[PDB]
Hints:
Chain A is an all-alpha fold.
Amino acid sequence: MGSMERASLIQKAKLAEQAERYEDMAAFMKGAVEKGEELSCEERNLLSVAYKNVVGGQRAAWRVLSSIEQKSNGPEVREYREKVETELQGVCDTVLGLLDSHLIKEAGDAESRVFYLKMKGDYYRYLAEVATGDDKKRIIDSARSAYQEAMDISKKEMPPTNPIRLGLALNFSVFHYEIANSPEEAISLAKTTFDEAMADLHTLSEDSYKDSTLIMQLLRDNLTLWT
Amino acid sequence: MGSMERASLIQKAKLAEQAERYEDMAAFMKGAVEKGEELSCEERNLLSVAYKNVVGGQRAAWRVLSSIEQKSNGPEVREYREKVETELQGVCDTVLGLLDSHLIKEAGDAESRVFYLKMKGDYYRYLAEVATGDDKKRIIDSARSAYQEAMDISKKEMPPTNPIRLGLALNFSVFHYEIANSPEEAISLAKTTFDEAMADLHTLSEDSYKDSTLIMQLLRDNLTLWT
Amino acid sequence: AGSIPGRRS
Amino acid sequence: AGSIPGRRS
Lengths: 227, 227, 9, 9
Ligand SMILES: *Cc1ccc(S(=O)(=O)N2CCOc3cc(OC)ccc32)cc1
Ligand SMILES: *Cc1ccc(S(=O)(=O)N2CCOc3cc(OC)ccc32)cc1
Ligand SMILES: [Cl-]
Ligand SMILES: [Cl-]
Ligand SMILES: [Cl-]
Ligand SMILES: [Cl-]
């Protein structure tokens, strides 16, 4: 995408989302990041939406294939699961590479830095979902470390209802439950996050209230599933 | 896919459908066709499902982008619509190439030959949906000719409830209404097809009855929309 | 107007 | 368990 203008890449990413062409969307946003400038709030959301949708489809396919493979236990199911897994790992590696070169290091405001570190935790978490080898523990720890740095910044710099702070806590709680084998930590984090947000809702406008309560409902939905 | 066994490609196409990985599915089925052997009934359905789903997503995206472009009337919307259009045309050309080299010429049984000629009509119809230039009339006529040959064979060789005969008539009626600007021909074809199938339902088993009535309902749904 | 789906579903 | 969606929808 080196020959296309930054503004054109952003415009086409928005069009690709409307057309539900998320692979295109991610390619346009990768091109935009590689222009080397920082991303605005809206542009960070375009980047996240694009890759979250691409990897989300890969994860769903990997889970279908992994279920078939486990029931089976020719080489075809394992080979095809391995092919999907390698493609998923490649996308995660691409996103992590964008964050490392150089989105995180240039992000000084709490909102941007937390957003990118939450993404870093997420993409290591997706790698951890499929990991089995010598590096599985290290992948899990890399997710944990990214989420923890994001949490530390968010608690110092953002109110407890901030939607990025809330989504980070939601995702880190999923990490604890599904990856780290720490369901009590997951439940504690979701509960404390929910309760501290509830007590700050009185400060919010109607539109901010809507955002915060929508994510609080996701925390509650997980708590209902886990308890 | 030249190095993968035919049977493995077929198996992986079935897995790809279960995982909703239709681009993979189409690539596996293209590889299977290129082994040079004829396709069984089940394999013909895998080929059609794969490409129908790939091009169906491209068509939906092209329609979103074309709507935005027409409302707008920078170069970005037109450029991106053109990119999606070119990719759609490429897939249609690929399918048509498989049918021409050499699925149709080797198909002697009425069921296989009608199935492939119906596909040929469909992929020229998808090309016609996006065509505007010197060849638009010729693309429309190519769809018409393929559907007409399929119709002639189906009326001689298949009962009026045969599901391939019914689906062919359904799709040719859509061609008449949406492409050829012949809504009366579309309505006549759908009505006559429905009525002749109705009068043959008494000959069918319960499972064949289900197949035929399901497609008859699609004919009726179109008639209700068109009248 | 609808054309034939890939599968009976 | 659900993680955050890409959009409010
Ligand atoms: C064009 C066409 C292809 C295949 C068939 S089918 O094998 O009889 N079959 C499978 C494909 O979709 C389908 C739909 C249906 O009701 C909607 C009934 C049977 C099929 C039929 C036509
Ligand atoms: C991790 C995270 C990213 C973005 C946001 S947001 O900008 O406040 N926003 C858009 C993304 O999805 C979303 C969902 C929601 O309720 C489900 C509320 C706000 C958003 C928040 C967290
Ligand atoms: Cl520039
Ligand atoms: Cl900065
Ligand atoms: Cl072989
Ligand atoms: Cl033959």
